[PDB]
Amino acid sequence: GKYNLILSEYLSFIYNSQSAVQIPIYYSSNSELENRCIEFHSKCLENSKNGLSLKKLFVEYSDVIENATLLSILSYSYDKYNAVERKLVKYAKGKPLEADLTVNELDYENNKITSELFPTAEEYTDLLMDPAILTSLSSNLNAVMFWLEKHENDVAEKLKIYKRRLDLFTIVASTVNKYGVPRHNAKYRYEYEVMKDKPYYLVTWANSSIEMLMSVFSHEDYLIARELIVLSYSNRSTLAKLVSSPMSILVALVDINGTFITNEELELEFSNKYVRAIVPDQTFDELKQMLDNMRKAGLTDIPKMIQDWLVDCSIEKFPLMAKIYSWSFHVGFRKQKMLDAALDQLKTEYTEDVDDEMYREYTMLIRDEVVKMLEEPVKHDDHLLQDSELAGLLSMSSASNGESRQLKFGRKTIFSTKKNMHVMDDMANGRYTPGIIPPVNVDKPIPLGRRDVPGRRTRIIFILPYEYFIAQHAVVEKMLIYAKHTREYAEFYSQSNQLLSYGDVTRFLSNNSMVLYTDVSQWDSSQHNTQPFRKGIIMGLDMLANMTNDARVIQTLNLYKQTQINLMDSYVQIPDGNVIKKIQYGAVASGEKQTKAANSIANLALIKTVLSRISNKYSFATKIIRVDGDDNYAVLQFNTEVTKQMVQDVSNDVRETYARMNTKVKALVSTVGIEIAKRYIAGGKIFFRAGINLLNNEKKGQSTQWDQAAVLYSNYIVNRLRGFETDREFILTKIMQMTSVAITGSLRLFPSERVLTTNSTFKVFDSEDFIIEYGTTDDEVYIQRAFMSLSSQKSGIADEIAASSTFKNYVSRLSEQLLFSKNNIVSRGIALTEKAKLNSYAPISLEKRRAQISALLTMLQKPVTFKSSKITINDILRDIKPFFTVNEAHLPIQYQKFMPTLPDNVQYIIQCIGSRTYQIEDDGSKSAISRLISKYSVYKPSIEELYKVISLHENEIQLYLISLGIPKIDADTYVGSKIYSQDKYRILESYVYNLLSINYGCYQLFDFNSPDLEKLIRIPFKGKIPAVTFILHLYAKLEVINHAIKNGSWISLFCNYPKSEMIKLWKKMWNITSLRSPYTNANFFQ
Amino acid sequence: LVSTEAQIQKMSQDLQLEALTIQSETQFLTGINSQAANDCFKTLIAAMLSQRTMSLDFVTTNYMSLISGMWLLTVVPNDMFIRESLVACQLAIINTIIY
Amino acid sequence: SNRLGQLVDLTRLLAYNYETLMACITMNMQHVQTLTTEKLQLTSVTSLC
């Protein structure tokens, strides 16, 4: 109930005029009181529509101001959207900044004038510095200045931070006022005509610099900001990658005293094991050269910060480094050209001096792995292999974005990238032809996409036809099935929904053991991803072909084989200005259904091939090997204790043993630590990488202004947990400014606190971080029933596409490929089912969601609706509440710290209860209905549909299930078995969890099976109503925990819930109408 | 020399050392490679000519290494090896194979 | 057991070359347990055998 006050002050601050008026609107769930609210509303609207003072009535109707609930505030004020300058003249008395063109390697990557690089606007492109975000610089500056004004009178350590950031913003604003403000278009892009007389790379630096200075809480932060802001104005290609590089060595210097362990994906079990740090001499010399480059770049304070820590090499002072390690990824992207980003990868040194004894072994291991993967399904003749075509045709929605192609649905034209729609287009003209695999050559080279991530290189993406997916699908899914239980496929091992977060290193770390960890991200254009890899797979297919008797399967295999033939020679469309290059690339990269797991395989085979050479000189027991995409690590234990000389000689031998296969590497050997893209360990303590740029994005998504605020807040929460902490108030200011909407030149709308933090499809953040907030009142239910009434919408584009000819053809081919003679009973069901996966197509979502926003807007303006009894969550909590009883408790300290970078209160929680140990099927994958879905498809279906589907009669369930590609015999058998009744509870668990972000964010990190949490929750057991006792125990846990978070102390509980209300609620259970947005979730592991 | 991959094949398929640990634990073959056979051939010859005592450094889990070491100790005398490593090798063999 | 002739051959060649190179020695080759000691990986022997 505080956000809105800051909103009011922002409104008062930004406009400031007599003519600037401020117009609240309220609502209440009580009829009489609502009519008085309507009255107040009316009179206020009138007064607003008559240039009358509004401030007088506000006292008379004080009751509405105190007890009624706000929605939004409008603002009518005359201005020509400037105001930044009109405030800013005072805050700009520092010195402006001068570029240095001889910093970046290229010439055009310097921050020189646009016209000196793009004289004509017809050849201009802002994409090499496009922020790619629907939020203005003016918004950012306005937010900063209002923040600065309000935090101008606090007197504490907070003020010492304020003076620091104030000095920084002076340094910034002097530089900005030197030239001026770039002006946004409707799309928040910046055209040539504003930047025409200004430096090209001023905007991203500006935005990134704002992002940095808003994340200053300490003295060392101020040092970092002063040392980066002035150097990030020039270096834009070798900076975050640079300073973030020494960390990989630093982790190998901290003696472990106390450890954390894995068994199964979150089984934590601490260990007091001690391990020393046997560092060689030459890695220090490597580090010194890196520091010489660091100083050569213009760095003074950060060598000192790296130098004064080494006197002790203690882990208590070490988080500074970790803090620093996240500041490298909050400086921005190196948004260079597709070409030049490829040429970071497309430099090759291929030699006829490597072994042949090695590649054959490599190929064989790949072959053997393929056979291990594919022995069972190829042999037992699974339906999904026979009907691979239909399988891929269902799983088109889970594919990549194909190249743009011109379609027409009756009487329109569309440029879709969705490959299912491409197939639909090709069906009409007789072009659907999955048996004839297209070539990939001079006559038809491939387009590209770029997978970026700051502080690292750019990876590439194939953009293929629709046959390749179909070919790779079935085989790769069976491979995945094999890979669910194989440990070494780290990206693919699971307990059917999890990826192993905290590694598998710490079991056997010791004074006698070592670990070799290695980045393999440049190994895409390499000489070991060409011919042997593919031919090994082809050989494996030959073996598998001789390991089966069915003919459909052999057809599939021969087509997949020929696909691998075509992928062995593959050319690549790449523009450069106007003309187009096509380059010989007969090798492997990302952008495929096969690439990820296959790269994991290939790296596994490669390292297995490398690993047979240390054995010529050392005896070790391979305890573990791991591969996850762009890195891999193997730990090994010896017959004796380790020395410096053995590590050095092993390292040189490893480097040269990669050199024998013509393979570059920064080889890294250690005893205690690793560093990889997504996480890293030092001294038996897990840290993480906080690298998500906020004001600069990777690529241009499809979301609105609205949802990008929610994703940015989710990323904020994540980065905060990682360690990189930004001031939450700034984020809130941005959220209000991005959900604010301009209806005219002078009308602007501003939503409120109780709309963005309320459980709906529009939730954005929370009033108290790490805690969803609920509604004990009528009013949150009331507006939720309204928004649920409005969430269900239509897309006329989808309606007319489903009424076209291509849709009919598609349905006909589906039918005659599966079954016939129920042309008016199921086929309509199948059309309705295909609709469920047309909605993946983005413009449909835009139509639907913009429609949702318009419908939303026509009741944000005007008063409220009673919404007709539709039960939701807050009704339940409203009814559960009057049977509680609180009591003061006092818990002890019994859990060990292993995530220092958390806030100390979060750690206090962790230092009193446990960390999570399971991961519940948030999508119901282990459910026996889903083990059918995972048998005939990969598709998710969302928990809205499932939660509804189980509630229906036994008739339309049959139609709905048969419509999903499933045959009739197994569906009938499923209905007879009655396992869905054994799955109401799992589905409801997943439903409530998805609604309440229990497996998404801070609550994803917590053990609800704990004994420590349970002894406070003294809810006796009744039985034969599982839903109630489940939800009661859960809600009570949340109550105690929220009380703990906000107040520190603990409490116990008690709920003698009457059986009468149990029965009254049992019928209210399976008619709930609620929903949470996918875009609001914040996965700590991305 | 013989191509390594054949021997890799037959060991790999008949042993199933993939299977013969815990399945959730790490086990596989070890170096059959070239530039070790001749390395050994040089090491052995130069040490026997020089009468340089040489030691063993192994892992007992890889019983194939020991199956080759017993051949080695059979053919090569025992006074060339320091008694401690020799005894270790024989003792693992006995406690593993013979008794 | 099924590397019979191959290991026979290995031993004969090794022994032959050992003795024929022994002949090109001039100082008495005397037997002592030396202080330090060459390492020998049995995996190399398996590669050889």
Add this chain to the structure above:
Amino acid sequence: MLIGNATVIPSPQTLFHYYNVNVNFHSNYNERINDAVAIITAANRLNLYQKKMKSIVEDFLKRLQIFDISRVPDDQMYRLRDRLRLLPVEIRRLDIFN
């Protein structure tokens, strides 16, 4: 309930570490005991009557680098002295003292 067909043996290097640690602790313990007993006996034979036999014990406990002398009283220290009075001095220091 979570256990089966999986033996875990401490590696020999861990054993050797633990053994050497215990050895070093025990040896330090005896050496400092012998030291202190020597000085106490010598003090008793030099008639030192103004000498409060605490700082010796403070040194004795400080060289064993695990205790907190800030929160151990004087009475325990004096008992430690009382026991130490009745101990033979080691051979080096004793012969050199005689």
Add this chain to the structure above:
Amino acid sequence: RNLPSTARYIRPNLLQDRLNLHDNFESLWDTITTSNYILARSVVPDLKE
């Protein structure tokens, strides 16, 4: 390694408690037992599988 007869080594003094510190030095025995406990925790093996 083989070691010559020129070499040497020092033997520790492993003479048992002359003081009987398990007789009314309970705060020290507490420290000792706690020390040995926490030391011993770093050497208990992890349950690997």
